[PDB]
Design a binder for these strands. Structure first.
Length: 255
DNA sequence: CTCGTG
DNA sequence: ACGGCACGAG
């Protein structure tokens, strides 16, 4: 009943997350950057109808807000083989080219796994749901990711933008990783016996035995939920000696 | 749809 | 030495 014991920790019961201890993010532009407003290639009604519900949900959650901005990038209707279930995919390439680069601190999976001792064979794998959306964007940086949204009937006039770290932004992975590392620094200190690996939104908790893996997992779940993050109950792999993590199958300390 | 990569 | 062309990705 791991789900019932930690309602606030699961995306299924705790609602959309929000990293309350993290200050809204300010995105520095390169020294020569000036706003660019790229035209929206007219979208077919089909793509527009598949995307509508997603845009409405995001608006209700406050993840998206109306705005007027000198910046504007294309919205694209990416989908599965067919005409069913779409999703809003933004082309932030002209924006990415204009924001100042940061040192990529997220380690590659190979080097990250090398830090897993053979002594810790009891694993718990958690996948944070809508990770980037948990980090707020400072109002001064929000205009940067604006895009056009139209709907014949009543609703919005033109541009919408994000209030949270969006998808497609080149620095989202790194900024989320560093943010979660700051939020879990304490947890690592209070649990010296545990091994916690972080790869953006993919987490692996390692323990010496089955008990302290259960007690540690309870602790991480409690902590994650309190901090405003949300783990997917569906994918969760709790206290197993065999788990799927970052493409590998961990067992006997192999791979 | 628009790019970058090979 | 090209430069059209899958393929991946925002």
């Amino acid at each position: 009943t791991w789900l019932s014991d930690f309602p606030q920790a699961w995306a299924e019961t705790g609602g959309m997350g929000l990293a309350v201890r993290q200050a809204p993010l300010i995105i520095p532009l390169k020294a020569t950057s000036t706003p660019v407003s790229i035209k929206q290639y007219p979208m077919s009604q089909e793509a527009r109808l598949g995307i509508k519900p997603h845009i409405q949900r995001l608006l209700d959650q406050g993840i998206l807000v109306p705005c007027q901005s000198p910046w504007n990038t294309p919205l694209l209707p990416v989908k599965k083989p067919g005409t069913n279930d779409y999703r809003p995919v933004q082309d932030l390439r002209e924006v990415n080219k204009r924001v100042e680069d940061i040192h990529p601190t997220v380690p590659n999976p190979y080097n990250l796994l090398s830090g897993l001792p053979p002594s810790h064979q009891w694993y718990t794998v958690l996948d944070l749901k809508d990770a980037f959306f948990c980090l707020r964007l400072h109002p001064t940086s929000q205009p940067l990711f604006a895009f056009e949204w139209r709907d014949p009937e009543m609703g919005i006039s033109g541009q919408l933008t994000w209030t949270r770290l969006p998808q497609g932004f080149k620095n989202s992975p790194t900024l989320f990783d560093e943010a979660l590392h700051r939020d879990l620094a304490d947890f690592r200190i209070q649990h010296p016996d545990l091994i916690l690996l972080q790869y953006v939104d993919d987490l692996l908790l390692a323990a010496t035995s089955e008990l302290d893996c259960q007690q540690g997992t309870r602790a991480l779940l409690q902590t994650l939920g309190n901090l405003g993050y949300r783990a997917s109950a569906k994918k969760a792999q709790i206290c197993q000696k065999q788990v799927k993590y970052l493409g590998y199958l961990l067992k006997e300390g192999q791979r």
